[PDB]
């Protein structure tokens, strides 16, 4: 038989790669063999649009003369002064360890293990809620529902991610979607296996129907996992 788009993506061709040369750099915090307790102070100088982030970025100049990119919170001004460390104040744009952060605070850009650089709640519009503070773990509510546990030395940022309310206005045409998907080269347009041929898909035929249940096992081999994968249920409710 023939292959799937699933299967050709895994090789890394220009038809599937990300055009990262078009983007602004990566967004990490600072390495913490440098941030023992010193509570760096910095100044925002620019706010900019990144084609790979679904969120604005902000350029910061520190007292070291070093320049970094952060993810911009909602309501940060060009000219402000943000602090990064354990004893910094509690405001919008300031990065602290979760232990020092009360219960009820909104939070973004959380590290998984202390030192990573920021793994959670970095998409535009998103936030997390602090629930509890033990001596061995902090519980946090993520934008999906999960109540995850983090070690209390992990770092987060206070406030909300800008860019919110992005999916309210419709995409009206197909050329606009062309441009949105050409920015980051997503596969667009999309075909349907039901209207493909039998070499090219587990569905596929002269009749444009599926002749087997769309539910597939988590132990089905590659080339066959198409549809609903390990579906607990289906339907409307």
């Amino acid at each position: 038989g023939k292959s799937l788009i699933q299967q050709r993506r895994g090789k890394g061709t220009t038809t599937f790669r990300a055009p990262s040369h078009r983007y602004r750099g990566a967004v990490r915090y600072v390495p913490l063999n440098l941030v023992q307790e010193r509570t760096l102070r910095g100044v925002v100088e620019e706010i900019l649009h990144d084609p790979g982030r679904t969120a604005p970025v902000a350029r910061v100049k520190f007292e070291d003369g070093t320049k970094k990119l952060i993810i911009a919170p909602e309501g940060v001004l060009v000219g402000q002064e943000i602090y990064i460390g354990p004893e910094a104040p509690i405001a919008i744009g300031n990065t602290l360890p979760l232990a020092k952060i009360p219960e009820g605070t909104y939070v973004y850009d959380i590290e998984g293990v202390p030192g990573d650089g920021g793994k959670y709640v970095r998409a535009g519009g998103t936030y997390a809620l602090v629930v509890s503070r033990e001596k061995d773990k902090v519980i946090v509510q993520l934008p999906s529902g999960e109540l995850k546990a983090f070690n209390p030395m992990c770092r987060a940022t206070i406030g909300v991610v800008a860019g919110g309310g992005r999916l309210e206005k419709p995409i009206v045409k197909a050329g606009k979607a062309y441009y949105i998907a050409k920015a980051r080269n997503r596969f667009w347009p999309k075909p349907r296996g039901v209207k493909m041929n039998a070499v090219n898909h587990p569905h596929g035929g002269k009749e444009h129907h599926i002749g087997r249940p769309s539910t597939v096992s988590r132990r089905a081999p590659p080339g066959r996992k198409v549809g609903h994968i390990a579906a607990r249920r289906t339907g409307r409710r």
Partner: protein
């Protein structure tokens, strides 16, 4: 304007349907109406890019929503972190 029901969406013509055209027009109306600055209190804030707003009168540039400079969650966060 000159038309009754359509606004910014009178450019699409008879195309794309009711819900589409209404949502588009409402959103763009609220975005193109001028907004109050948080630094000078004057109504001159305009959008610059997606997520970025600027006052034409004082030069304050700040980050916000995609189609409005504030969000409900942002308001809540402001209030909560002011309380604590």
């Amino acid at each position: 304007g000159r038309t009754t029901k359509v606004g910014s969406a009178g450019r699409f013509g008879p195309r794309y349907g009711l819900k589409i055209r209404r949502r588009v027009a409402a959103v763009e109306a609220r975005m193109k109406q001028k907004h109050v600055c948080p630094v000078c209190g004057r109504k001159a804030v305009r959008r610059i890019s997606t997520g970025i707003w600027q006052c034409q009168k004082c030069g304050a540039t700040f980050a916000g929503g995609a189609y409005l400079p504030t969000t409900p969650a942002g308001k809540v966060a402001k209030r909560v972190t002011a309380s604590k």
